[PDB]
């Protein structure tokens, strides 16, 4: 009752499994989730046998279409005999989880026709549920009696068979097991890891048959290990000619360092840390370093080292979007929902500002925008969220992120921070330009880890002594030498959290106490006169 | 005419027990190592240098040149028959193809005459063969490749203009039936094929079985495929024509080597395509070798005149002779003609961007001078600002007959790859296109917020802009917000701005009349005894000058700083419409950089630097 053409046993370790039971016992959460919860779709991890033996791993990726069913049938069959009183109606499919990251994701060769591969990117657009017919059966003429034959997988329900006897929709939908399946068109965008900007980035069509659709949230980071497939595209629907080009698509199947940190605290107590970090961090930035306060603290003539300053953010943190007006209308930034008239299917378009959560967006030339736009940002600035109200969708999209820029009636208070570039009219300052940049113009890994790993656990707390300090500050000094009365000052506590985020210090010392005080004087001058 | 068996035996002996004089005239099994590597599946593509054959088998080379496809297939079969004798062990089953191949060989051995009962030769290859064009045949220009050379291995030069994404193409299609149990193979050569329906396998037709067949992609052979269009080098196209494009198809390991806009050398077989009065067909090129130029990266002594003769008085005086003067304006063109191809090996990527701006098109017919800029300068391509609409850079939907699904194309800017970019009629460009220019100004930061297009364009050429004035000559009486009509901030980004007013300068006005009178008098357009000379002589002398690569001294920059100081007083007091800033310092160092190339001394050079300052002062404040 088995064919030897593929030479696949049950796990290839049935004889090794008996001694595995008596030797390995002599990570509990993996075993216990199965027995107690009874959760389907077993979610086994990376193939760790590849560390032990490569041959066992190499045989589960060459023909994975013939391997996944083997794992599914074997695991279920054992439970059926051991546990006859379990739920056999809900099939369980063993799924690889965080499989091998295919080398040179950029260079996906066509040679690996049918193998698991791991793409890494983002989700651009998602399609509405597209039902499909699965396990189709035919209709006989002899008393309309159907015998179960197609139980074994491997048949293909080719189209154009139901252009006669359309009763199959009403009649054979349920009785011949022809219920519609689920599939979702998904377009990922490969992340070239700050490529030198050579070749264009490849698009991938992720739309496979598996019914796990939307149990993984779109609009996140992509770590979907999938199975490559190729299908012949018809040249014309009218004829049967097929061209010798196939569309790629990917199957949906998915569900020392700390020593360095301690060193930074020891050198932190030195009183020359301010000059050392400012000089070394972002050295490509020219004069007018008061602007750096927004950048340096928060991250860790127009375009006069200004637009370039934005380029640093785009270069430093790839998480974000850079855009500008005067070339895009209000609908050009988001809520661009549109359908394709050639294929007659709707697309629920989104926008970049929507995708801008957990980042900083680069928008400049804000004064040149029209009054029709700037509406969506206004809620974001005043409600920290982005609501999209169109006929299809009425809700709010999370905007738990910060965006800042700079400028050049008193209803301006909508802005978080306002700074004006003043001209000291000092020719000596420009002199440093030629020597600083023109004359001058492994470590990259170190700068990357600072944000992701260290900042993940750090959460400052405000002591009792450090709160009232700003409150008592503005009241007394405001009448000496002659708007502060709003609660705008209190909001400055948000940026105060940056002081503690330096040195990873949850405690407050003499450093960063007078630093917050002078910030009032810098804001006072630009609001004076 | 000649027996193919004899030629196959000849090539087999040539590869196996025949010798060469590559390594000190000693045989070292040059191709033997590569054959061994093929046996172990460690090298995928095999190249046969025709030069090696031509060293000691001229007749074989001539026969190969006179017919390419047939000898290519013969060599492929010979290499296939050479493999089994170099087998040493069992294949470690690198991929699905190896597994299928070894099962197929096992099945063949198990059961061991109709000519249709064997594995096709292309299915069991796992190797690809290609030819490198022998140096004996000089490269041909695309226009000279006509129908008469069909089937002959030719080599042509050009520039890539449209490359599609890598996609898989199917060579052998595998069909399996539920009754026969065997494998049915349909080799596919045309770009379109017809799937099988009823198997013509003899077993089923004799048995009148169902013969239902299902196409599969498991055991099929796949090869890499690409489509590229290539256009002639502008330098050698006659002035009386425009370059033409010829289609090239590249397959296998040779793919992913050509990049858009790059000079490529292509060698392949010129073959026809069917699209299914008389029998009509198109043409393409199945490339076998793509080699880029190295230049794409990043006998007495009296024969030259470098240091003794000044370049200013000879080179400049023979540039743009049709122009009626503007010698000071002419000098800046030389700097533009030089550009920033020659840069120091210090990471100064900004040096090659020289975005010069010209305001006023009706002035002294300066629209004509663009063509001379393209023709004389090497590595320069003729471009037009008004050559297409705004759709030429983005993607749109138009009707097509030959080819093109989801068309992705660039404009004039991308067309000139690190060359000279010519843009005309700036004013007539729509508002959106103006932003497209402005995003180029920000050092290649082309961001598109449209759903289907998210490309990042690489603009590295030198941009020259000509702009018509605002429906008439500028009038002083008009104050700000009215006097200049093109956006001022847009002009600010440009490094150099030039505008010419046709003032009633009776001293200069007489000069124009004198030169137009000497027209129609004789055939010497430059009456000051300057001969046009051959373009060959000028280009050859210029090329060797690039190899010197002089470097300016950094210490001298301290002198320049004073110039910004005096400029500030003038900028504040004038309150004029034109305004400058620290960009001048940015410009000056770049501007001084090119001038010093004439005098390759670079120890003490003051006059060269000072002249660039004087050039700025001449144009501004002409009153």
From Swiss-Prot, chain A:
Motif Arginine finger mapped to chain: 413-416
Positions with a binding annotation for ATP 1: 414, 487, 490
Disease entry from the Swiss-Prot or TrEMBL record: Immunodeficiency 54: An autosomal recessive disorder characterized by severe intra- and extrauterine growth retardation, microcephaly, decreased numbers of natural killer cells, and recurrent viral infections, most often affecting the respiratory tract and leading to respiratory failure. Affected individuals also have adrenal insufficiency requiring corticosteroid replacement therapy and may have an increased susceptibility to cancer.
Major localization class: nucleus
Protein name according to UniProt: DNA replication licensing factor MCM4
Full-protein interval shown: 150 to 774 of 863
Gene name for this UniProt entry: MCM4
Subunit structure: Component of the MCM2-7 complex. The complex forms a toroidal hexameric ring with the proposed subunit order MCM2-MCM6-MCM4-MCM7-MCM3-MCM5. Component of the CMG helicase complex, a hexameric ring of related MCM2-7 subunits stabilized by CDC45 and the tetrameric GINS complex. Interacts with MCMBP.
Modified residues (N6-acetyllysine): 54, 265
Organism: Homo sapiens (Human)
The UniProt record lists the keyword Nucleus: yes
GO CC terms of this entry: chromosome, telomeric region; CMG complex; MCM complex; membrane; nucleoplasm; nucleus
UniProt: ATP 2 binding residues: 286, 306-307, 408
Taxon lineage: Eukaryota, Metazoa, Chordata, Craniata, Vertebrata
Molecular function via GO: ATP binding; ATP hydrolysis activity; DNA helicase activity; single-stranded DNA binding
Swiss-Prot record, chain B:
UniProt superkingdom: Eukaryota
CDD domains: MCM7 (cd17758)
Keywords: Acetylation, ATP-binding, Cell cycle, Chromosome, DNA replication, DNA-binding, Glycoprotein, Helicase, Hydrolase, Isopeptide bond, Nucleotide-binding, Nucleus, Phosphoprotein, Ubl conjugation
Cross-link (Glycyl lysine isopeptide (Lys-Gly) (interchain with G-Cter in SUMO2)): 13, 26
Gene source species: Homo sapiens (Human)
Phylogenetic placement of the source organism: Eukaryota, Metazoa, Chordata, Craniata, Vertebrata
Name of the protein this chain belongs to: DNA replication licensing factor MCM7
Broad class of the protein's primary localization: nucleus
GO CC term (a single one): chromatin
Region (Interaction with RAD17): 500-543
E.C. number: 3.6.4.12
């Amino acid at each position: 009752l088995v064919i030897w053409g593929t030479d696949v046993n049950v796990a290839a370790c049935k004889e090794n499994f008996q001694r595995f039971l008596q030797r390995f016992i002599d990570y509990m959460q993996r075993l216990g989730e199965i027995n107690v919860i009874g959760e389907p779709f077993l979610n086994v991890n990376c193939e760790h046998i590849k560390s032990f033996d490569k041959n066992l791993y190499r045989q589960l990726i060459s023909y994975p279409q013939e391997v996944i069913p083997t794992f599914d049938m074997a695991v279920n069959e054992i439970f059926f005999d051991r546990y006859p009183d379990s739920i056999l109606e809900h099939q369980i499919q063993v799924r690889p989880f965080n499989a091998l990251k295919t080398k040179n994701m950029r260079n996906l060769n066509p040679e690996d026709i049918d193998q698991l591969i791991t793409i890494s990117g983002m989700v651009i657009r998602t399609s509405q549920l597209i039902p499909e017919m699965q396990e189709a059966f035919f209709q006989c003429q002899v008393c309309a009696h159907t015998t179960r034959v197609e139980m074994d997988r491997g048949r293909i329900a080719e189209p154009s068979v139901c252009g006669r006897c359309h009763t199959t929709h009403s009649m054979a939908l349920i009785h011949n097991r022809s219920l519609f399946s689920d599939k979702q068109m998904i377009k990922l965008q490969e992340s070239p890891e700050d490529m030198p900007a050579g070749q264009t980035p490849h698009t991938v069509i992720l739309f496979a048959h598996n019914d796990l659709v939307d149990k993984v949230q779109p609009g996140d980071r992509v770590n979907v290990t999938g199975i490559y497939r190729a299908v012949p595209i018809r040249v014309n629907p009218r004829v049967s000619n097929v061209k010798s080009v196939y569309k790629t698509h990917i199957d949906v199947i998915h569900y020392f360092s700390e020593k360095r940190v301690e060193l930074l605290k020891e050198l932190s107590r030195k009183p020359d840390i301010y000059e050392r970090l400012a000089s070394a961090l972002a050295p490509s930035i020219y004069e007018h370093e008061d602007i750096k306060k927004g950048i340096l603290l928060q991250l860790f003539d127009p375009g006069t080292s200004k637009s370039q300053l934005l380029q640093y953010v785009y270069n430093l943190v790839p998480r974000g979007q850079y855009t500008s007006g005067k070339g895009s209308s209000a609908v050009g930034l988001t809520a661009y929902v549109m359908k394709d008239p050639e294929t007659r299917q709707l697309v629920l378009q989104t926008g970049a500002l929507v995708l801008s959560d957990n980042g900083i967006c680069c928008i400049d030339e804000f004064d040149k925008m029209n009054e029709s736009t700037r509406s969506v940002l206004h809620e974001v600035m005043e409600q920290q969220t982005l609501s999209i109200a169109k006929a299809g969708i009425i809700c709010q999209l999370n905007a738990r992120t910060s965006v800042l820029a700079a400028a050049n009636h008193t209803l301006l208070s909508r802005f978080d921070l306002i700074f004006l570039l003043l001209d000291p009219q000092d020719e000596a300052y420009d002199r440093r330009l030629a020597h600083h940049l023109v004359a001058l113009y492994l470590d990259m890994a170190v700068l990357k880890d600072y944000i992701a790993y260290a900042h993940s656990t750090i959460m400052p707390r405000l002591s009792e002594e450090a709160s009232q300090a700003l409150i008592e500050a503005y009241v007394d000094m405001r009448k000496i030498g002659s708007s502060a009365y709003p609660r705008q000052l209190e909001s400055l506590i948000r940026l105060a959290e940056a002081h503690a985020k330096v040195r990873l210090s949850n405690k407050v010392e003499a450093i960063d106490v007078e630093e917050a005080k002078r910030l009032h004087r810098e804001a006072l001058k630009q609001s004076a006169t | 005419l000649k027996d193919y068996a004899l030629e196959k035996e000849k090539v087999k002996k040539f590869l196996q027990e025949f010798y060469q004089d590559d390594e000190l005239g000693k045989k070292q099994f040059k191709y033997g190592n590569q054959l061994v590597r093929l046996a172990h599946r460690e090298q995928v593509a095999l190249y046969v240098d025709l030069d090696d054959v031509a060293e000691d088998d001229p007749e074989l080379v001539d026969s190969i040149c006179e017919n390419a496809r047939r000898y290519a297939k013969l060599f492929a079969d010979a290499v296939q028959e050479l493999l089994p004798q170099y087998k040493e062990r069992e294949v470690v089953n690198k991929d699905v193809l190896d597994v299928y191949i070894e099962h197929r060989l096992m099945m063949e051995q198990r059961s061991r005459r109709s000519p249709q009962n064997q594995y096709p030769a292309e299915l069991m290859r796992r190797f690809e063969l290609y030819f490198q064009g022998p140096s004996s045949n000089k490269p041909r220009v695309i226009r000279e490749v006509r129908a008469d050379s069909v089937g002959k291995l030719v080599t042509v030069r050009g520039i890539v203009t449209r490359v599609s994404e890598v996609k898989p193409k199917m060579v052998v299609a595998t069909y399996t039936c539920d009754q026969c149990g065997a494998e049915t193979y349909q080799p596919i050569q045309s770009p379109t094929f017809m799937p099988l329906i009823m198997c013509p396998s003899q077993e089923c037709q004799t048995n009148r079985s169902g013969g239902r067949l299902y196409l599969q992609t498991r055991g099929s052979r796949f090869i890499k495929f690409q489509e590229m269009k290539m256009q002639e080098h502008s330098d050698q196209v006659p002035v009386g024509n425009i370059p033409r494009s010829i289609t090239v198809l590249v397959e296998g390991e040779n793919t992913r080597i050509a990049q858009p806009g790059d000079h490529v050398s292509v060698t392949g077989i010129f073959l026809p395509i069917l699209r299914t009065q008389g029998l009509l067909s198109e043409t393409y090129l199945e490339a076998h070798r793509i080699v880029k130029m190295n230049k794409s990266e990043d006998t007495r002594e009296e024969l030259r005149q470098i240091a003794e003769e000044d370049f200013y008085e000879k080179l400049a005086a023979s540039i743009a002779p049709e122009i009626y003067g503007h010698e000071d304006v002419k000098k800046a063109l030389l700097l533009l003609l030089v550009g920033g191809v020659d840069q120091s090996p210090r990471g100064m990527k900004i040096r090659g961007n020289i975005n010069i701006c010209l305001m006023g098109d009706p002035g002294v017919a300066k629209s004509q001078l663009l063509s001379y800029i393209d023709r004389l300068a090497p590595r320069s391509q003729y471009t037009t600002g008004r050559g297409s609409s705004g759709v030429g850079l983005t993607a749109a939907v138009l009707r097509d007959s030959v080819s093109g699904e989801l068309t992705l194309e660039g404009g004039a800017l991308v067309l000139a790859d690190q060359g000279v970019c010519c843009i005309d009629e700036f004013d007539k460009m729509a508002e959106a296109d103006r932003t497209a220019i402005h995003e180029v100004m920000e050092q290649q930061t082309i961001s598109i917020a449209k759903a289907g297009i998210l490309t990042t364009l690489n603009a590295r050429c030198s941009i020259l802009a000509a702009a018509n004035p605002a429906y008439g000559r500028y009038n002083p009486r008009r104050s700000l917000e009215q006097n200049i009509q093109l956006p001022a901030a847009l002009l600010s980004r440009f490094d150099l701005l030039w505008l010419i007013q046709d003032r009633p300068d009776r001293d200069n006005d007489l000069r124009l009349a004198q030169h137009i009178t000497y027209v129609h008098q004789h055939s010497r357009q430059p009456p000051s005894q300057f001969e046009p000379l051959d373009m060959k002589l000028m280009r050859r002398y210029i090329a060797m000058c690039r190899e010197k690569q002089p470097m300016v001294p950094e210490s001298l920059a301290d002198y320049i700083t004073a110039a910004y100081v005096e400029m500030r007083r003038e900028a504040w007091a004038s309150k004029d419409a034109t305004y400058t800033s620290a960009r001048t310092l940015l410009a000056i160092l770049r501007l001084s950089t090119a001038l010093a190339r004439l005098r390759m001394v670079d120890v003490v050079e003051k006059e060269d630097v000072n002249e660039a300052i004087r050039l700025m002062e001449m144009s501004k404040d002409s009153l």
